[PDB]
C-alpha cells in the first residue's frame, strides 16, 4: 500500500500548505485598501483602429519602444504596426495559418509566433536582405503552442497544450529546460520584470510559479473554478492577475502565496481572454468574451471603466511599457488603441 | 502634407502591404476549408490518401475549386481550447468506419459526432459524413448482427438496411436540422467518387451560404 500512503501524505502536505496560507491571512487586501478611496471613472477613447487583418486576431504584443506592435491573425499573417501612424511596418506570411500566440523580442530584432502546428517560429525582422526570414522553427512541443515570451534574442519561453512549458535556446533550437507539472493545457505565460521567474496558467484552474534557471515549480496558486486563460505579472513582479472562463480575475501574491483579491461581477458571466496591468498596477485591464474590456481598480476590485468598441470577442490585450496606451485585439479583425 | 519624405515612403509601403493583404484575402476567400474529423482507426487516413505533430493540411484542387483540408489528428489536447479556430470552415468532413459497430467504437464515433454537430462554433457548418469500410461491413454483417451496436434495431441484417439504419442513427444526432445539413456518403477501399461527393456537397454548402448571405435566407 505504498501508492495510497503517498497519496495520503500528499494530501497531508496540501493540508499543511493550506493551513500555512491561512495563518498568513492577517487581513484582506480590500480590508486594507478601503480608505485609499476610488480612482474614479476611467474613460478611454479609441485613438487608433489598426485595420488590415482579415480574420480573427488571436495574439498581439507591444514592442518595448511602446510604439510598434506585432499582431497575429489566423488569416496566416503577422503584421508589425506603427501605432503612432497606423502604418504597417511588416507583414509576415506564416507557414501555418493557425497562429495562437505572438511575441515581440525586447530588442525588437525578432518576432515569434506559434499555434496548432506545435512550433514556435522565430522571425528575423532585421535582415540584410530587406525581408523578414524565419530564423528558427522551434519544434518539440507535442501540443498547440499557447503563449511565447522572449527572455532575450536567444532564449524564449513557450507555453503549450501538452501541459508543459519549455525554455529554448534559439541558436541551437533545443529545449534547455522543460517545465513539467501542469495537468491541463497550459494556456498563457507571464515573464517577471527580472526575467528570472515566470508564471503559467493552465486548464486546471491552477497557476504555477516557475524558476527559469533552476527549472523547478516554486509555488502553485489555486482558487479559480475553470481554465485560466490569461496570466499577467504585477509591475513589481510580486503578484499575479489570472483571467479564467468563470468570469473572474484573481490577484495572487508570490510572497504571501495566497489569492489577495477577486475581480468578479454579477453582470459578467463570460470568460476572460486576456488580462494586463497598468504601469503602476492600480488598474487591471481584462478582455472578455462579451466583446468588452473592463478596467478594474486592482486595489479595491471596483470596475473603473469599460473599453467597449469591439464587435466580437476581445482575444488579446496589452499595455505599453511606458503605460501610455492600451491595445485590444479582437475576433472582429481589428486592433484598437485606447488612451 | 505635414509628412516628411520618409513618412510618405513608409505610408506607401503600408499601402502596398494593404494591397498584398487584399490580394491574399481575396484568393483565400475562394479556397474551400474542410475540417477533417473522425475517431481513431477510421478511414480518415485512407480518404486523405485518396484526396491528394500538430495540424496537417492537405491542399487539393478539383474542377475549378481549390480545397484545403485540416487533419487535427494527433492534436490530443483539450479541444474546447482550439475548436473555435475552425469556426468558419466551409464544412466538416467526419469519417466513420462502418466495420466498427461490433468492435463500443461506433458509439464513440456517435458521441464525438454529437459534440461536433451540436457544438456552438458549428451551428451553421454542414457535415460531410463519410461512412468508410463498407465491404468489410458487408462481410461482417452476415455473421455479427447490427443489434450488437444498437439494441433496439428492428430490420434486416442486410447491407442496404443496416447501412441506412446507421446513417439515420448518425443523422438524427443533428439537433440543428434547420441550420445545417449532413451529407452522408458510403466510401470504400477504392471508391474514386469521394472527391466528387465532396465537390457536390461543398457546392451545395456554398450556394446555401450565398443564399443566407444575399439575404434570401
Amino acid at each position: 500500500s505504498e501508492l495510497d500512503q503517498l497519496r495520503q501524505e500528499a494530501e497531508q502536505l496540501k493540508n499543511q500548505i493550506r493551513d500555512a496560507r491561512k495563518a498568513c491571512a492577517d487581513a484582506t487586501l480590500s480590508q486594507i485598501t478601503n480608505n485609499i478611496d476610488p480612482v474614479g471613472r476611467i474613460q478611454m477613447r479609441t485613438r487608433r483602429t489598426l485595420r488590415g487583418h482579415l480574420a480573427k486576431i488571436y495574439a498581439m504584443h507591444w514592442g518595448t519602444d511602446s510604439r510598434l506592435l506585432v499582431s497575429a491573425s489566423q488569416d496566416g499573417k503577422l503584421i508589425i504596426w506603427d501605432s503612432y501612424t497606423t502604418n504597417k511596418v511588416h507583414a509576415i506570411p506564416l507557414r501555418s495559418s493557425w497562429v495562437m500566440t505572438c511575441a515581440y523580442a525586447p530588442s525588437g530584432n525578432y518576432v515569434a509566433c506559434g499555434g496548432l502546428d506545435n512550433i514556435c517560429s522565430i522571425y528575423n525582422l532585421k535582415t540584410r536582405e530587406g525581408n523578414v526570414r524565419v530564423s528558427r522553427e522551434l519544434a518539440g512541443h507535442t501540443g498547440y503552442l499557447s503563449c511565447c515570451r522572449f527572455l532575450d534574442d536567444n532564449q524564449i519561453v513557450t507555453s503549450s497544450g501538452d501541459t508543459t512549458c519549455a525554455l529554448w535556446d534559439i541558436e541551437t533550437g533545443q529545449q534547455t529546460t522543460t517545465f513539467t507539472g501542469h495537468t491541463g493545457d497550459v494556456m498563457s505565460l507571464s515573464l517577471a520584470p527580472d526575467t528570472r521567474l515566470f508564471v503559467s496558467g493552465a486548464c486546471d484552474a491552477s497557476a504555477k510559479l516557475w524558476d527559469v534557471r533552476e527549472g523547478m515549480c516554486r509555488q502553485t496558486f489555486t482558487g479559480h473554478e475553470s481554465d485560466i486563460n490569461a496570466i499577467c505579472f504585477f509591475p513589481n513582479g510580486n503578484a499575479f492577475a489570472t483571467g479564467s472562463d468563470d468570469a473572474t480575475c484573481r490577484l495572487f501574491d508570490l510572497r504571501a502565496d495566497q489569492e489577495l483579491m477577486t475581480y468578479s461581477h454579477d453582470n459578467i458571466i463570460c470568460g476572460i481572454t486576456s488580462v494586463s496591468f497598468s504601469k503602476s498596477g492600480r488598474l487591471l485591464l481584462a478582455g472578455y468574451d462579451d466583446f468588452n474590456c473592463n478596467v478594474w481598480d486592482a486595489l479595491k476590485a471596483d470596475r473603473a471603466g469599460v473599453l467597449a468598441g469591439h464587435d466580437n470577442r476581445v482575444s488579446c490585450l496589452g499595455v505599453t511599457d511606458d503605460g501610455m496606451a492600451v491595445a485590444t485585439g479582437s475576433w472582429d479583425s481589428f486592433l484598437k488603441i485606447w488612451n | 502634407c505635414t509628412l516628411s519624405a520618409e513618412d510618405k515612403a513608409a505610408v506607401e509601403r503600408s499601402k502596398m502591404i494593404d494591397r498584398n493583404l487584399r490580394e491574399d484575402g481575396e484568393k483565400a476567400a475562394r479556397e474551400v476549408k474542410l475540417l477533417l474529423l473522425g475517431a481513431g482507426e477510421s478511414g480518415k487516413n485512407t480518404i486523405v490518401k485518396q484526396m491528394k505533430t500538430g495540424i496537417v493540411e492537405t491542399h487539393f484542387t478539383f474542377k475549378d475549386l481549390h480545397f484545403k483540408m485540416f487533419d487535427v489528428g494527433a492534436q490530443r489536447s483539450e479541444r474546447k481550447k482550439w475548436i473555435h479556430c475552425f469556426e468558419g470552415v466551409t464544412a466538416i468532413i467526419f469519417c466513420v468506419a462502418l466495420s466498427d459497430y461490433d468492435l463500443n467504437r461506433m458509439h464513440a464515433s456517435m458521441k464525438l459526432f454529437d459534440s461536433i454537430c451540436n457544438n456552438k462554433w458549428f451551428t451553421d457548418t454542414s457535415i460531410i459524413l463519410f461512412l468508410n469500410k463498407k465491404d468489410l461491413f458487408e462481410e461482417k454483417i452476415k455473421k455479427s448482427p447490427l443489434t450488437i451496436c444498437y439494441p433496439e434495431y428492428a430490420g434486416s441484417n442486410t447491407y442496404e438496411e443496416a447501412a441506412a439504419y446507421i446513417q439515420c442513427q448518425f443523422e438524427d444526432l443533428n439537433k440543428r436540422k434547420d441550420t445545417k445539413e449532413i451529407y452522408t456518403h458510403f466510401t470504400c477501399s477504392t471508391d474514386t467518387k469521394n472527391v466528387q461527393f465532396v465537390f457536390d456537397a461543398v457546392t451545395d454548402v456554398i450556394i446555401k451560404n450565398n443564399l443566407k448571405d444575399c439575404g434570401l435566407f
Partner: single-chain antibody
Amino acid sequence: VQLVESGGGLVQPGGSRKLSCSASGFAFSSFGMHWVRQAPEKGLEWVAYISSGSGTIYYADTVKGRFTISRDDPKNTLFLQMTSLRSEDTAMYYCVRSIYYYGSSPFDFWGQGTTLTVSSDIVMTQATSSVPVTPGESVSISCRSSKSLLHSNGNTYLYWFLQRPGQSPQLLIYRMSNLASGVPDRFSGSGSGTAFTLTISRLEAEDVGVYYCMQHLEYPLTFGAGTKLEL
C-alpha cells in the same frame, strides 16, 4: 547584397544612354532605389528616385525631362535612360538601395558605380573641405543646413556617408544619431536641427575618406560639399 551598374562609357554630347543595375542578394522589389552621381573629382549629387512598387518617382531639377528612371522587378534590375546628354553628366552613377519604414536604414547599400563620360533646395554646408588627422585622436566633422532638418515628428533627417578613396560611399549614421549596421561605434552623431557633427573617437587608417552630409527631409536630397580626412 550586390548592385552592379552597367552602361557607362564615352558618349557623344547630346546623345542618349541607359544605365542598368543588376541587383543581387536582397528583396529588390521592397526597396526604393536611387541614382546618385559624382562628377570626376567633386561631391555626391542625387539624380533620381523610384519607390518600391515604382509608384513614386522624383528627379533633380538638372535631369528633369532628360533622365528616366525605371524599375524591372522580375529581373531585379534598375534603369536610367539618359537623353540629351551634356558634358555636365560626366559622372559616376551609383545605384543606392533605400527602404523606408519605422526605424529603417535608407541609403544603407550603394552600388559600385558605372563611369559615364560625355565629351529653394536645402543647402547642406560642410564648411570644412579637408582635415589632416592623426590615427587615435578624436575628429569632429561638422555640417550645417539652410533649413532645420528637425521634423515635426521628432526625426532629424541627416545622413552621414563615408567614401574611402577607391570605393563607393558607405552609410555611417542615419537620421543624425543612429549608427548603421557594420560600422563601429567610434562614429557618433549629434546635432541641433541646423548644425550637425560627426565624431570619430579613435581613428584608424581606414577611416580616411570623404565624409558627406546628406539630408532626407525634402526632395531633392542634397549632399554636403564633402569633408576629406587625410593623414
